[PDB]
Symmetry: C2
């Protein structure tokens, strides 16, 4: 309807399904980035209405591009997307200033619904009844207590990555992987590896 | 195959919302205009959707929510308001709402909030002031007020003196004076002129 967007995701199939969705609804495509290291600059230059960032872009992760853009006073629409479920990750994109968080696992129709919701000045984030109704409300609060890096170290641990792999992916030292690991294990009140498993399996992460 | 209960004493909105729900094959089980019988009658009929104006008399619309969530109601709850009340939305979201839609901005957001809830997401107003600009501080003070201070505030913007509010909230003039000062302290407003400039600068009405 006369709008445009930039896609920032390095999942080749996801780029296709998003490009097809934006085009099918008359939205122009200024760019398609697969790395964040220039995302902040590209978006500030081309000034697109919509920006779609996968949370797991390499170089600088998806939420980090969102935080920097907002710190640098970018006011346009930003809708974080994920290849995982990552329902707890939605609240963290909230307090960081995003307009949307949609998991590409349930389809592209939530991406377009997140766009029109941001068009109307609203936002389109996952809903966790387990934060207000249930027994896993304490664990959900500890997940909201984590930091931007602690979340990443957690999601990497739940994928089976070692401290060297996490250091290379997050561009930090091995001492910093171990530091994040501890604070993370603390906030979640886990002490052993099995504690983190049953924590993730309880809250389904 | 969905059904809903509408709770609102704005006759122009009851017609506004009943029509929109019928336009999407959503049955209307009950049409309340009262807070005291809300929590009881919702659980008696057990509807999928409950749409509640924040200004309903008796029990505050935010309390119908909190009590329904505390009594472990798992259905869709979508708060609405006659004004804009963007700051009010975050208080609903943290209280367990599936959405907060300002009726000032049309009916199509109600149904969009419903769809967002059906898909497991939520639909709340986006507040750019919280993340970008020079009013990020003031927006946090608004996001820190209590559910009472909120109401005590909004009545002062409306233009109700200390006497009306005490009756409108069914409380003593002394307790009104306590809330007002806590409000005035949290908002860093010393005079009534301060609140006018605060409200106008942050666009509250």
């Amino acid at each position: 309807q006369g709008m445009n967007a930039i896609i920032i995701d390095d999942h080749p199939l996801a780029i296709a399904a998003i490009r097809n969705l934006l085009i099918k609804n008359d939205i122009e495509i200024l760019a398609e980035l697969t790395e964040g290291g220039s995302a902040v600059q590209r978006v500030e230059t081309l000034k697109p209405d919509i920006v779609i960032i996968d949370v797991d872009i390499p170089g600088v992760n998806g939420i980090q591009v969102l935080e920097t853009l907002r710190k640098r006073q970018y006011s346009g629409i930003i809708i974080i997307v994920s290849a995982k479920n990552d329902h707890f990750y939605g609240k963290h994109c909230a307090d960081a200033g995003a307009n949307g968080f949609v998991s590409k696992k349930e389809g592209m129709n939530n991406i377009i619904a997140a766009i029109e919701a941001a068009k109307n000045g609203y936002c389109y984030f996952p809903f966790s009844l387990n934060r207000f109704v249930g027994s896993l409300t304490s664990d959900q609060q500890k997940l909201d207590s984590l930091s931007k890096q602690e979340i990443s170290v957690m999601r990497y641990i739940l994928d089976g990555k070692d401290n060297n792999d996490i250091a290379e992916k997050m561009f930090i030292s091995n001492k910093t992987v171990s530091t994040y690991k501890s604070r993370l294990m603390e906030k979640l009140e886990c002490k052993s590896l099995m504690d983190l498993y049953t924590f993730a399996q309880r809250n389904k992460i």
